[PDB]
Design a protein around this ligand. Structure first.
Ligand code: ZN
Ligand code: ZN
Ligand code: ZN
Ligand code: ZN
Lengths: 90, 90
């Protein structure tokens, strides 16, 4: 029951890079020589990384939604498929 | 100017796996023997993959937002930092 393992798992579940986690463990073991500025910087970095991803994934999701909704999804010959036509224009 | 290269790039920008792209190129080269059901299935699979990711990334973003907002981010000794306390409870 080494408590820092739970700490690490939680940082992991938040998608912190191994390098960021090393920094956090460094702060955790010696708090008297680190500040809120350092720990917050690590969080802001990870937060910006996540928000940028979510944005580029939602862009894809919107395009994928249009592609999905326009196709009939039946035995209709793919010779007429809008999905292939769309991927052609991009 | 081999047009299928543009096709591939567009599928790439949508985050389709290499295997899905192989399937699309197979449909593209021989449309007379494939249907909208096949091409749509490939799109739905990718769409569900993206929506699940966006959901797990937004979960992180919400937690990261709370962590970020609660910390003063100044020289305040990390001995009092809420970020480390939070990562402790998870
Ligand atoms: Zn159709
Ligand atoms: Zn179709
Ligand atoms: Zn503080
Ligand atoms: Zn703090």
């Amino acid at each position: 029951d080494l408590q820092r393992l739970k700490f690490i798992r939680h940082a992991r579940q938040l998608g912190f890079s191994l390098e960021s986690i090393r920094e956090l463990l460094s702060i955790r073991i010696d708090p008297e020589h680190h500040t809120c500025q350092e720990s917050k910087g690590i969080v802001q970095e990870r937060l910006q990384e996540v928000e940028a991803r979510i944005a580029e994934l939602q862009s894809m999701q919107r395009s994928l939604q249009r592609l999905n909704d326009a196709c009939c999804g039946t035995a209709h010959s793919s010779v007429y498929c809008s999905i292939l036509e769309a991927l052609e224009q991009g």
